[PDB]
Amino acid sequence: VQLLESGGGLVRPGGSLRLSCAASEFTFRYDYHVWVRQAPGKGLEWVSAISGSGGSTYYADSVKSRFTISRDNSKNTLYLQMNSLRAEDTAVYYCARLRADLGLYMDLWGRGTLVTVSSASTKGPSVFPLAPSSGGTAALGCLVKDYFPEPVTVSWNSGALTSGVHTFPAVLQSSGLYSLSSVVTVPSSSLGTQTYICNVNHKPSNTKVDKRVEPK
Amino acid sequence: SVLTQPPSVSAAPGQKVAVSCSGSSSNIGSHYVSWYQQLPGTAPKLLIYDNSERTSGIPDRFSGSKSGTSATLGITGLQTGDEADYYCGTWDELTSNLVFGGGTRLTVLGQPKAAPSVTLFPPSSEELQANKATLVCLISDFYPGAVTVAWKADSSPVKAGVETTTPSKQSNNKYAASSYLSLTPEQWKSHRSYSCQVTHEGSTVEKTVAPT
Ligand SMILES: [Cl-]
Ligand SMILES: [Cl-]
Ligand SMILES: [Cl-]
C-alpha cells in the first residue's frame, strides 16, 4: 500500500510543472486524494482535493486558477498541473488519500517531491566585515552574501584561529541565493594589537577573498 | 496556520506531554480532528483520526480528545523515537479547506534547557557604500531546537526582507540559527534602532543596534 510522487525539480519563476502520484491500491478510484505542500522549515499547507472520479475539485485560495488537480483512474495516477509558479510555491509536495469515517482524515501519504521555484545561477558572494562593537569579549565576523551554489569555506587567520569561531549554516533565501556568516569571539583587549582576517572561498564562481575585520 | 498549537513541548524519557490545538466554531467546533506525526526528513504519518481513534500500529501511549473548539494530543512513556513535529488537522466549513496547526516540535530532553546566545551586527560601512544594508542576527547554543525570530524598526514589526534558517544541531548537540533583515541604507539611517527578538521556550532575548 503506497503513493509515489514524481515530476519534482527546478523550475524558473513564471514556469509550469506537472506532478504525478502513482497509487498501488485497487481502491484508488473509490477514494478522494489531495496534494499537501510544506515550505522548508514551515508547516503543512493543504493545496487541492479531487473526488474518486474527478466530479468535484477543491483548491486553497493561494493556488486557485494557477493549479489544476486531475486523475486517470485507468493508470491509478493523480496529477497536479502548476502554472505561473512563484518563489512562495517552493516546497515539498505530498500526495495523500483523504477518507471519511465519522469525519475526514488523510490516512496514506507519499514520500514527497521537492519543487524549487528559482532562477538562481552561479554567483560569487559579496564579503563584508562585521566590525566588533565599541564579558570583556567582543564578537567580530564576516557576512558572505548572495552566492550560488553551495558550498563556501570560511577560515580565520588561515586556520590558525579556531577557538571562539562559529561558522553558521547558510540561509537559502526566497531568491534562491544563499548567505552565511562566521563569527569569532575574542578579548576586547586584543582588538588594538591582533589582526583578524576571514578567508572565504566559493570555488564554483572562482571567488576567493581575504577580508580584514577591524574595530569601528 | 488557521489552527493554533504551541511551537514546542518537551519532557525527559519515560515522562508525558500534552499538545493543545485551538480553533473556531467552523473548524474544530463542527468537524473531527486528526493528528499527524512528522519524523525528521520524512512525510507526515496519521496517528489519530475522529478526535480519539488510533491508526494501526500506534500504541495506547498516544491519545486524543476534543472539547468545543479545542483538541489535545497526549503522549506518555516518551521514547527518543517520538521526537518529531506533530500537526493537528480538520475541515474548515467557512473556506471549505483542509486546515492544519502550525506544528509542535516534541523534544525528548537529552541535556538541560539552554536559552539562546544572540549576536546582532549592523550593516558594514562597505555594504552601505554599495547602496545596500543587511542586519545579521546570529542565534547559538539553544536547546530544545525551536525559536521564533521577530524584527523591529524602533517599536514597529518588520516582516518584509526577512530570511531565517531552521535550527541545526551544533557539535555540542545544542542548536544554531540565523536571521537576515534586508533594508535600504535610508531605512537603516532614518530609525533610532532595529531589534532582533528571539523567543525560546516562552522567554524573549533581544539585541538592538543603532546607526549612531
Ligand atoms: Cl468519490
Ligand atoms: Cl466523482
Ligand atoms: Cl469532519
The DSSP secondary structure of B103-164, one letter per residue, reads: -EEEEE-SS--BPPEEEEEPPPHHHHHTT-EEEEEEEEEEBSS--EEEEEETTEEE-TTEEE
Query: Which of B7, B15, B16, B5 lies closest to B71, judged by CA?
Result: B5
CA–CA gap between residue B192 and residue B22 (Å, rounded): 38
Question: Are B101 and B71 within 8 A, CB to CB?
Answer: no
CA–CA gap between residue A204 and residue A185 (Å, rounded): 30
The domain A3-117 having CATH identifier 2.60.40.10: the answer here is yes
* Sequence letter at residue B79: Q
CA–CA gap between residue B100 and residue B92 (Å, rounded): 10
Q: Please count the structural domains in chain B.
A: 2
CATH number for the region A126-212 comes to 2.60.40.10
The domain of B38 spans 8-108
Q: Looking up cell 504551541, which residue turns up?
A: B6
CA–CA gap between residue A153 and residue A200 (Å, rounded): 6
Give CA separation, B142 vs A123, A173, B197, B207, in Å. Answer: 33, 23, 14, 16
H/E element holding B61?
none
Residue B132 domain flag: yes
Residue B54 domain flag: yes
Residue B1 domain flag: no
Residue B64 domain flag: yes
- Which resolution, in Å, applies to this structure? 1.7
Which residues, 6+ apart, have CB-to-CB distance to A56 below 8 Å?
Answer: A49, A50
Question: Are A146 and A126 within 8 A, CB to CB?
Answer: yes
Residue B156 domain flag: yes
CA–CA gap between residue A73 and residue A66 (Å, rounded): 23
Contacts of A130 in chain B (CB under 8 A): 121, 124, 136
Is the torsion defined by CA of B198, B204, B205, B206 positive or negative? positive
Task: Mark yes or no for CB contact A58/B97 under 8 Å.
Answer: yes
Q: Is B95 an 8 Å CB contact of chain A?
A: yes
Question: Are B170 and B186 within 8 A, CB to CB?
Answer: no
A211 to chain B: closest CA residue: B126
In this structure, what are the phi and psi dihedrals at residue A38, rounded to the nearest 5 degrees? -145, 110
Contacts of A58 in chain B (CB under 8 A): 96-97
Is the torsion defined by CA of B124, B126, B127, B131 positive or negative? positive
Task: Mark yes or no for CB contact A61/B95 under 8 Å.
Answer: yes
The CATH number of whichever domain residue B181 belongs to comes to: 2.60.40.10
CA–CA gap between residue A95 and residue A113 (Å, rounded): 9
